[PDB]
Amino acid sequence: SSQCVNLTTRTQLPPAYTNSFTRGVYYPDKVFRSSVLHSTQDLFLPFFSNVTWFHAIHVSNGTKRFDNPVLPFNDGVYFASTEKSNIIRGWIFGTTLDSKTQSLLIVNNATNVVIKVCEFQFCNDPFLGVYYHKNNKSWMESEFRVYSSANNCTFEYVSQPFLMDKNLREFVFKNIDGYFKIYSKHTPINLVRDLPQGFSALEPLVDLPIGINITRFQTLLALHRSYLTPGDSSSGWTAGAAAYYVGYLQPRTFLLKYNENGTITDAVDCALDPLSETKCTLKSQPTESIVRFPNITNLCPFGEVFNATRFASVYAWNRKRISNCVADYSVLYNSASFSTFKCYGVSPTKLNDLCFTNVYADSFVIRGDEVRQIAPGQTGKIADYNYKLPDDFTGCVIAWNSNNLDSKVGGNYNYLYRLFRKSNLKPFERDISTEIYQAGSTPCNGVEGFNCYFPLQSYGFQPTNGVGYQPYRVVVLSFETVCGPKKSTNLVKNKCVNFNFNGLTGTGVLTESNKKFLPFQQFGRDIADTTDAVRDPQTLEILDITPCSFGGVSVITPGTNTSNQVAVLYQDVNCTEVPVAIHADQLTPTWRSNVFQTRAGCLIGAEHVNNSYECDIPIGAGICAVASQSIIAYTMSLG
Amino acid sequence: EVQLVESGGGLVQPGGSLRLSCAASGFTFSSYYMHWVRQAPGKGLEWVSAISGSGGYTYYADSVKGRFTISRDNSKNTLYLQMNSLRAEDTAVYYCARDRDHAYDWGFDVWGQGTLVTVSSASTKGPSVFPLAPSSKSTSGGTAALGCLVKDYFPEPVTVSWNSGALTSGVHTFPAVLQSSGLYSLSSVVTVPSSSLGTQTYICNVNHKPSNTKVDKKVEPKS
């Protein structure tokens, strides 16, 4: 790190509280989509949200001041500013931004973009020098005064300048799944002080595989030597010329409207107000997700059965009980060595996100001609006398080429199959019957002849035999301990979360409960089939499932075409304030004027009118509903 | 003392409706799990329904799913069993069943006595009391048998004794069976000394609680 200088004054300037308008929209995915509405839960700036009216540097006799603060990163940062002086040069991201942690660096000059991620030691007020090159009459960077040490770089990127060429440039910085996603957009404006109203779907610039924890940031500025004079004076530089404006992304739900060009034109937050949330319900609140599966288990022994050196005959199909293990089906589904892959009830994909009580493994060897009849509901000697699949089979059936396995010089006649059985095998039945079959009225007593025949015949699968005659291995997976990957995350109580238990998913609040599920019950439900509570594995504790703060959301809408003003109906609550306004955000829970308690429930804001009118849009309890350019309510008339 | 009296049992037509009452005393009916169980006439037991947390929750059987509804009540601490669209297989003696599963004990609580429930198209008929005299020549042994017999009733029970006031010897009890005429038939005997037949006089105690029919019947060994 460079030698650091003390420029910040003890005098502090207070922050401000102003609106974000409708800025900060960026593309959630790179998949080309057009004229489609996409819902997503990710990090964003809500509309009308708190953005601070910061001043990076401010000159307040000739008295001048300098106060460049430090802000944490949390989940994500949105930045934009109105400046064409290029004094704003870059940013730093990371956790502490000292030499203790790996940190990323982006470099931009008149030539190109340079990126490096070494162990940098950043000063409290990092800066770069700039000077006027009078013979060529150009402002040029002089020296680097940010870091004197750079070790262990793991990424480098070179491209044309993006922040170079009243000038509003708007940038988005993310670091997700090891990729540092940078979204960029530039806009000339006709404003000075505030962030202008209106929408701007901000363009995705580039994704960069950095992969480092980031919890704090600070904007990078290039300070002129004028203030670097030994006094507190900046003779040739406006020590107040730089101001920044930063908002914090929050995990929120958004819907994106696409045009026929594939370009995003408008978006609506479900967390703006119930008036906005109305359009979310009609297509015209959670903050986090928690995932917990049965854990503390090893891997499942698929290789012990799939990759077995010796494979049993078809009439001797086996049972392996599979339990207390984690199963990875991607290596099985995506193996390039399985010609037959049919699953019933469950999809071939997303098996790694599913859990099962018990799984049975079926394995044998049959020829290519015998591959086709391996399916539920088939008929034949294998199907009727050797192996009968249940009609209601839940699982997968797998067959593939296994050609080069069971040949020998001199004839290999190991495997056999059944020709005679009086009755079909039941679903999941075993019969080891090998009695000498009687084909007549004379009891055979193990002696063959006319009407007395041996029920078993040796295959003798031969390599020189035809392709269909050649042995191909087949596997059936019976689904009744076993789960897909994901180490269970710790639990969080009293917070609105998206929960995923042992294959069951849902959203709500996890809290302690008194309902005692039976020692082998994992989930319990009340009336209307609502998952009321779940019992936590590895601790056998019971957690209640409470919806986040209530009331059914029914749309009372005149229509978007005429006006965007409607009313909210609370069916069976007293005038208890949405559980004492737990959120209290979003314009103070959407203004929390007139309170009109009805037999149909409690109503906020809408005036009650003494006289009655013909019913237009009912709310309940005899009251229907615009007039005086405002939302109105009145008792319905009977004629 | 904890006591689960039952009321509301009786005769109902097929497809009918009924609410059974099981008053609970001696304990907090609003804090202990409480159940219903049924046991077919002459057959085993079968689970019916339960209140998971006294004061709330729900729990039904598929054999009573949709057709039958369970409910409790607060304050006076009474239990209810709402039956709808009853069937012939629904016929059974019913027990307002107990429970303590919520606490460390994994079993049930008390076992109140439980009361019969019958679904049939027949009508309730007053019992026809019939005498059972001994032989005037009954000297086959010291034991002499009589029964202040009941016939053609619906349903059980009764008691047994005989003959007019003060000769209490030889109590025995016999159970009833169903007969082909559609009404239950009950018998019982008495093992008295052959000396105590008709000179001194015992009591007949025969009553049917639904019909409150008490008849004091007289036997002198005929002629």
Place this chain on the structure above:
Amino acid sequence: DIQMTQSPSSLSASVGDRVTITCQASQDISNYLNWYQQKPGKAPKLLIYDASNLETGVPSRFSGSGSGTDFTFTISSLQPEDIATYYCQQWADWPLTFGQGTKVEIKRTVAAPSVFIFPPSDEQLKSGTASVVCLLNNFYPREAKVQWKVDNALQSGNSQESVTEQDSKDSTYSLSSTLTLSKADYEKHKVYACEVTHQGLSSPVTKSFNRGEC
């Protein structure tokens, strides 16, 4: 659902013997099993819970154990009050099913039943119902044939039977047979007698009644 095919359906042994009644299971319920004792015409009561733990106030001669798919349970010493039918419950979650039942009874010495006939009185003559009960009291065992004959002609399908459950005092069986009849058939028939086949009886001992006390 969980199925338990208890065997035997019914067994009997002498007083003080050790009795094994099999509760099977379906799927590894471990030790979540409770035991029930139910006397005839009485409300069921627990016998052992948690597959090994006796309840308070339960005789120490009642004991059970097991896990998985077979559950032993023993009656160490049969007692005259042990007369009952016992049920093994499924305490597995999803609580759907009880035991199909195992009935236990006592071996006893074969004993002849005290026979008697009740002639229908004038009040049955008044009522018109002719009922004759030929008494089988304190006899053992229940396989004992009562032969009915009227006017030296064997009767069949016109009689009824009623089997007592165990007595508390003597544990011995009791039976009543009712040769049902209408009055009309009674004034046109004379000979009434009952035969009872029993091991302790050298021959089925008859009592014979005739209307008019003959």
